[PDB]
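Structural prep section.
Before we set up the soaks we want a predicted structure of the protein with chloride ion in place, mainly to decide which crystallisation condition to try first. Input record follows.
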Amino acid sequence: SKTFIKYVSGIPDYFKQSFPEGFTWERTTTYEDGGFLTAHQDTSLDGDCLVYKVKILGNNFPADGPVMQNKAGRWEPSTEIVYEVDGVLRGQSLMALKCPGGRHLTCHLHTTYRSKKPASALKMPGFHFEDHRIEIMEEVEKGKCYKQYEAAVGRYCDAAPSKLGHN
Amino acid sequence: SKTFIKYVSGIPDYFKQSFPEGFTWERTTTYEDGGFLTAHQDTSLDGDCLVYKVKILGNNFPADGPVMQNKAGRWEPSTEIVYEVDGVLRGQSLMALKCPGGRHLTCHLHTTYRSKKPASALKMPGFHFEDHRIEIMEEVEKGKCYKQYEAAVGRYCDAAPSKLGHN
Amino acid sequence: SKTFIKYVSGIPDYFKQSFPEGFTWERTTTYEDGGFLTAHQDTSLDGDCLVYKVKILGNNFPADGPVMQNKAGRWEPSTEIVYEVDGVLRGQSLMALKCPGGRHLTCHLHTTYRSKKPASALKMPGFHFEDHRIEIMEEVEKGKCYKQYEAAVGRYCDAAPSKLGHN
Amino acid sequence: SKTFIKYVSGIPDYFKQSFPEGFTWERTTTYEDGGFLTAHQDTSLDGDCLVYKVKILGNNFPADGPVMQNKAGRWEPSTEIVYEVDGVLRGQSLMALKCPGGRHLTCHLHTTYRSKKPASALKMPGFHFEDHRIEIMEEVEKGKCYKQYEAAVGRYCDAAPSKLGHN
Amino acid sequence: HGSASFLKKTMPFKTTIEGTVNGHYFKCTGKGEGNPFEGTQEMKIEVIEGGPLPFAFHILSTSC
Amino acid sequence: FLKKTMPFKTTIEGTVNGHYFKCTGKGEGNPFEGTQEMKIEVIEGGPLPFAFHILSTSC
Amino acid sequence: FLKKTMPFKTTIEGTVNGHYFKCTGKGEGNPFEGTQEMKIEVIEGGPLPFAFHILSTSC
Amino acid sequence: HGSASFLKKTMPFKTTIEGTVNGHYFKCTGKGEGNPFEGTQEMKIEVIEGGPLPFAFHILSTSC
Ligand SMILES: [Cl-]
Ligand SMILES: [Cl-]
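Run finished without errors. Recording the C-alpha cells verbatim:
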C-alpha cells in the first residue's frame, strides 16, 4: 500500500507521481525454510478512493514450520532498498518474523514497482531506504478478521553519513 | 503434465495412482538473472480426457534478458530429484535455457505434488530421478501458437551403481 | 571490523563485551550475477592493538561482470539485521554497488559472529539494525593500495515507530 | 576428483585433456537450511601420482541441524549439468543428504573448472550430465578416518530422446 | 502546494485478495484509511472464502 | 481409469512482468510410454511479449 | 600421461563454523572406468565436530 | 565508566588477508585506527602478493 509513505530529504515519490492512473507491483518473497509467496497487485484511484486488486500464489511452506503451524509471532520492522532498474523501480528487503519464544524466521523480498505513467513523465528517485513498521494490532477472529497498521518512511542513511557528500 | 511418465525399475507412480480424483502441483522457478515464475495446477479426469487448470505469476524478469527480449533458444533436457516430504512429493531440478551467444540461462524449480487421494491409499516412491525432454516442435504463429513435445522417464541412477546395495 | 560501532538506545555491544579474548566471524556473500565471496576472520587484542586474520575464497564471478572487469563504482550505505541464533549472533544484509553510469549490482551477506567468551558471560542484544557506510576514499594505486573508511551505528527502527512499545 | 570419469557417447574429457599441467576447481555449495561450504582445489600430476590441494571455508550451518549434530545418513547419487562459460567449464548440481526422520537435506553446488592448458589447446564438451555416486564405505574411526568410494559417468540424456536430433 | 493545509489529510482504500497457499484457496476483502504524507495507515481484512486460514496471516501482510 | 493413449486439455491464466495473458491447449500422449505432444494457443494477451519457454513446464 | 589405474594423494585444510581442521588422504582408481576409492585421515582438529559428508565433494 | 573521559578515544588495528578469487591468489596487509565508541575507522590496505588485483577491490571491503 505504497501510496502511504513519508518521504524525507527531498526524495521523489514514485507512487504519488503515478496518479491518477496508478501503478502495479509484483513480488516474490523467499523464506529461509523453503516457502515462497508470490503476488501481483494493481493500484487504481476510483474518485477519492484507492482500489487494490491482489493475486497470490504461495508454495513449499514446510508443514512443520511457523507459517503452516500458524505460530508466526509478529514482524520486526524492516528496511527496503529501492532503486531504478530498466526504467522502473526495484525493491529488495530482508524481513524477520519474531516467533513465540524468541527465534526469528527470515525472508527476502524481491519487488518491481511499475508506474502506469511513462518513465518520461516521472522524476525517478535515487537509491534510498524505505522503512516499514507492520503491526497486526487486532486479531479480531482466527483465521478470519485482522486489523493491520503500517508506518513507512523513505529516507537516506542519515545515522552513518558520507564523508564525501554522497546520499 | 505428470501423468505421462515411463517409470522403470519398479518405481511407484504417484500420479497414475491418484486417479480418478487427480492431483495438484505448485512450483516456484527461480532464474539465475532474477526472474521468478510461480504456478499452481489442478489435474482432473473428465471421462476420457485429462483436464489441466493453471495459474501463473511471473515477475522480476530483466527487461534486457533473453526472456523479456524473446531471444531464447531451447531447453536442454533436465533431471528432477523426487522424494517424499510432509506425506506428499517434493521435486527439484535445474533447467538450462540455451540462448544466443553460447549462453545458458539456468533456473531452479522447487515443486510440491499433492495427490487428491489420502497418503494412506498410496504407495509412495523412494528417492529417484525424473528425466524430462521438452521440445518446441513448432512456433506455428509468432507469440500466439506453439506445439510442444515432452518425453519423461522415472528411474534410478543406473549409470553409476552402488557398492552398498542402494538404488 | 566490528569493534568500531556506535550503539545507541542501550543496545548491548556483543563485540566490545568479547574482549580481551576477542571474537571470530564467518560470512558468505552471494552476488545477483552469480559470484560468491566467502570469508573467515579472527579478531584478537594484542596489548592495545587489534589484530585481524582473514581467509577468503571467492568464485563464480562472471568474466563480463563489474567485479572481474574492475568496474564496480562504489558501495551504497547498507543496513544489516542482527539477532541471536544458537547462542551466537547472526547478521544478514543487502548491499549494492553503484556502478559507473548508474546501475546497481546487489548482493546478500550471510554472517555468523562468534564471541570467544561463553554466551553465559555476555548480555546478548535483541534484534536490531547496524548501518554501515563504507567509502574507498583513496585509490592510492591500482590494484595495490587502498584507503577505506567506515562508519557504523547499531540502532532500532526509529523513523517508523511502533504503536505498541516494540523496539 | 574429476580425472576419474567414464565418458560415453564421444563426449570430450576436459579433465584428462588437461595433463600434464592439470586443472583447478572452485565451488560454493549452498545448503537449504542456511549452511555454505566453499572450496578451492588444485589438481596436479607428480610423476605417476595425482596430487590434490584443497582449501575449505564452511559457515552458517545451524547448530541444531544434521551437519553440526553429526547425524547425517548418506548421499543420494546426483547429476551435475556441465557446460562451457567464459572459456572454461561451469557445473551445477542438486545433492540430497538422507538424514534421520525421513528427511532429505538438499544443497546446490555452483562449480567452475579451470584447465591449466589454454582453451585453444582443448576440445570443449557440449552441454551434458555427469552422474556421481558417492558412498562412505566405512567410518574407520569416529570423526577421524573415513573410506569413500565414487563412480562417475559423463553422458547425455539417453532415457528420453530428442525428436529434433539434439543430444 | 504552498503548505500542508492544501494536501489531502487522509485517503481511503479498498482491497480484494485471492490466492492459493500450499494448495489452500482463499479470498479476502479489506477496507482502510491512511495519511498519504504522514505515511501511516490501517486496514481491516476479512476472509470471505477459505477461512479460517490454515496458515499464518503474516505471510499476507505485505500484500493486502 | 488410464488408457495407453489419452487426450488432455488445458486452460492457463497468468501475469508475467505486468503482462496479462490466457491460453488454451489440447494434446495427446501415451501415459505408460511417457510421451506427449500438445498445441497451445494464446487467446488473450497475444502476441506474448516474452519467451514462451518460461511456460513450458506449466502447460 | 594417464594410466588405467592411477593413485592419488590429497591435503585438505579448512575451517567450518569456526572449527579448524586438516586432513590427508590416499586413494586409487581407474580413470577410464570412472571409479575410485580413498582413505581420508583427520590430522588436526579431530574428531570432527560435524558430519564428514559436507567434505565428500572436496576430497 | 562515569563519563567519556575514561574511555579509550582511539584504538589501532592491523590486518593480514589471504585468499583466492576466481583462481587468483593474493595476500594483503593493512593498518588502521578507529574510534570504538564513535563507530568510525579508517585503514590502509596493501597488496603484497598477487597485485595488481585482477578484480574490483570492493568485494574485499567487508573483510579487511
Ligand atoms: Cl541512484
Ligand atoms: Cl530479539
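Observations: Residues 138 and 147 of chain D are 5 Å apart (CA to CA).
Flagged for discussion at group meeting.
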